[PDB]
């Protein structure tokens, strides 16, 4: 499957793509404002994620640091990134279908649209100014808006027992972005697409 990753932000981002225990394609790349990077993701990829990283520095070996979404200091991510990270999430070729969503469960750093480029389903978007409107207690000094689990580490926010409800914090993310997961047990906003669809992830789709 092809994913075209497009940076429409006015600032550089470092795109990342991983399934948690391995890179997808090269795993990461710099995208200047306006740049597009097309990656190939193996069919059957379960639990894949794409995200943006901001304010990164890498040396000639591709080691460094990002202020949001850092994946063990690598340019080419092999693991998931450090919150806050808006997440494009996907599982491909799962019994004949693809499943896509956007999640704020690990916080929000950059607005995103995640849409198919092929027929048969709709896209999802979280493009509101969540960082600007972020509650004081969730603001990440390094940049972005943390999820409550990251900040407070309670069973209720982290849904450790599989028994949790919405919270004042989850409701903030849900109010700004109804079409993204706001907590672990949120009413699913997952979209079912034909198996083997192709996609575009756009950072800053409205600006």
UniProtKB/Swiss-Prot annotation:
The entry's keywords: Cytoplasmic vesicle, Disulfide bond, Signal, Taste-modifying protein
A Pfam match: Thaumatin
The keyword Signal appears for this protein: yes
Gene Ontology CC annotation, any one: cytoplasmic vesicle
Protein name, UniProt field: Thaumatin I
Purpose: Taste-modifying protein; intensely sweet-tasting. It is 100000 times sweeter than sucrose on a molar basis.
Superkingdom in the source lineage: Eukaryota
Family: Belongs to the thaumatin family.
Keyword S-adenosyl-L-methionine belongs to the record: no
Cystine pairs: 9-204, 56-66, 71-77, 121-193, 126-177, 134-145, 149-158, 159-164
Localisation: Cytoplasmic vesicle
